[PDB]
A paper describes a structure:
RAD51 is the central eukaryotic recombinase required for meiotic recombination and mitotic repair of double-strand DNA breaks (DSBs). Here we report the cryo-electron microscopy structures of human RAD51–nucleosome complexes, in which RAD51 forms ring and filament conformations. We found that RAD51 forms multiple conformations in the complex with the nucleosome, such as ring forms with eight (octameric), nine (nonameric) or ten (decameric) protomers, and a filament form. Notably, we found that in all RAD51–nucleosome complexes, the NLDs of RAD51 directly bind to the DNA wrapped in the nucleosome.
DNA end binding by the RAD51 L1 and L2 loops is also observed in the nucleosome without the dsDNA–ssDNA junction (blunt end) in the presence of ATP. The RAD51 L1 and L2 loops are known as the active DNA-binding sites for the homologous-pairing reaction.
Residue numbers in the entry:
A (entry chain M), B (entry chain K), C (entry chain L): 101 to 270, 289 to 339
DNA sequence: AACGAAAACGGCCACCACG
DNA sequence: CGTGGTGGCCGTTTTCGTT
């Protein structure tokens, strides 16, 4: 179980993400999906006794929001070497849906030589909206997304890593494929509300957390 | 941080625009978006110790409002050579959305040979309204705008320059992409009210400034 | 500053029209736009010490309202030779928007050989409504008007002449291009109310004037 | 008796207003 | 900002008139 670094969120998840499965967090923009991704990108490298996976991180960005400085802040919060964190995070920006899936081909071969624990795909659904904008082409983007999700599941079962994808809510296919769906909504200021909206094992429940300069971290009224 | 040349606005932004990110200023017509652009087009060339970026400026105009004389006024205000300011500002008028995006192809290659600090796109959303006026073609202009914004983010991360685009409020996609949204409204006479309407780091707050012959400059009751 | 020949209007404008810039007067029909044009067509020829520009006049008519006799009346009011006034006013009626813009080609070359101070375009927006009456052709007339306005600004900067265009209010593009917007409304009888509705330098303010056989001239209760 | 044109009705889309 | 309602425009079908 990879620690989220929010204790309340860890309790909500019973200790953190299950490696080897896809966890989807759907919420409005600015809810902190990207911030949680940046935090996990570092916490994954933490020792297992500290809630990490003792593995490198993979950040596939489609939205430009990748900040190595956020990774440095998370590393210094938990006392990890920021330089080693950036050395254990491989980053690449996907320009389109086809490029987004093509990066998985390099990811599968690269993930064999080194132990990874986390795969991050940020604005995973944005490129299927920007690229495929027509109505007759909807089935094509749905097929590409389906294949992409199957590839995610395959890599998860192959390397035993956690698969994190982010969705902006301004597909029903992900429900059966994703094991845990988390709904994120803004509480005013920088403090966010998290809700579980389906889990066969986890209750439907809510937990409050905040977005702090160092971290994605528990709410401290 | 590129100085806005309004001290109150600089305080509002904590010192000025972050280079390497897109800052959107949405407001009514005649609020001073273009005036701020003209001021920044010169202030960017200022020394870093003076709040500049020590880089050349790029003005992509779609509305005809480009005035080299305004640049000369800003240069003489801060004591910069007006001729050198015009020599460090490359200007081109986009005739359509396709031409607006096509100019980015020349911009990316040209921005490699010389250091730039500011990219200005004035009436950035006007051409998507004048060109794409139908209702069935809305998705096409939205896709073109999405690609344009992604190109802006790519150039920002590539050259570490500030990306400034102006929007007339007589898209929701820009919210996640733009880092700082500023709402501009008219105070009567030539003095304008600025408000921050989203920033993960900057407070929602307001600052009063004026539009002076020399400058975009602090309000002086 | 070209005298309007109304003292109250001159005070409203701080002495008269700035040459080298476009001044737009928007108002209802019969408010006196054409009358003001006829008056200025003669006052421009007045000595600079008398509020003129010591230059010839250019009247481009689209509405048939051109009256040389009104020019003769204005000339005799200020004591100018009516025959020389008509000799210093070149007149041409535009039959369409394309012809209206085409006349500018003859105007630019003709304005080089002799000094002019005033360019008048009467019912400037009427031909874009009579010619382009459909809804799909709106962008075409807007583009033609935009190019026409840019040509006006170019000629203004080239010859340092005043650019006067008249608009019947039974485009938002002119706002940034026009420097001074004047709203004209009828006071009953022949006495008209003038209001300034935008000027970066001139206050929003009003002045009362009348339309007299000799002149456009101050209100005399 | 057949074909073409005109008029009327219905449905869909867009814009405006209200919550 | 989103949803619902109303109005306008366009397309299709039916009926009538003319060849």
């Amino acid at each position: 179980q990879i620690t989220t670094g929010s204790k309340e969120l860890d309790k909500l998840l019973q200790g953190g993400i299950e490696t080897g499965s896809i966890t989807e967090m759907f919420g409005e923009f600015r809810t902190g999906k990207t911030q949680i991704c940046h935090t996990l990108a570092v916490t994954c490298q933490l020792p297992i006794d500290r809630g990490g996976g003792e593995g490198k991180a993979m950040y596939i960005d489609t939205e430009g929001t990748f900040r190595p400085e956020r990774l440095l802040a998370v590393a210094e919060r938990y006392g990890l070497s920021g330089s080693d964190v950036l050395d254990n995070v491989a980053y690449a920006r996907a320009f389109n849906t086809d490029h987004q899936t093509q990066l998985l081909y390099q990811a599968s071969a690269m993930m064999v030589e080194s132990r990874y624990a986390l795969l991050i795909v940020d604005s995973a659904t944005a490129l299927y909206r920007t690229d495929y904008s027509g109505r007759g082409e909807l089935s094509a983007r749905q097929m590409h997304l389906a294949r992409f999700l199957r590839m995610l599941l395959r890599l998860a079962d192959e390397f035993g890593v956690a698969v994190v994808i982010t969705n902006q809510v301004v597909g029903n296919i992900i429900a059966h494929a994703s094991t845990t769906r988390l709904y994120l909504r803004k509480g005013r200021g920088e403090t966010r509300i998290c809700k579980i909206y389906d889990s066969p094992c986890l209750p439907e429940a809510e937990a409050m957390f905040a977005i702090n300069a160092d971290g994605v971290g528990d709410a401290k009224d």
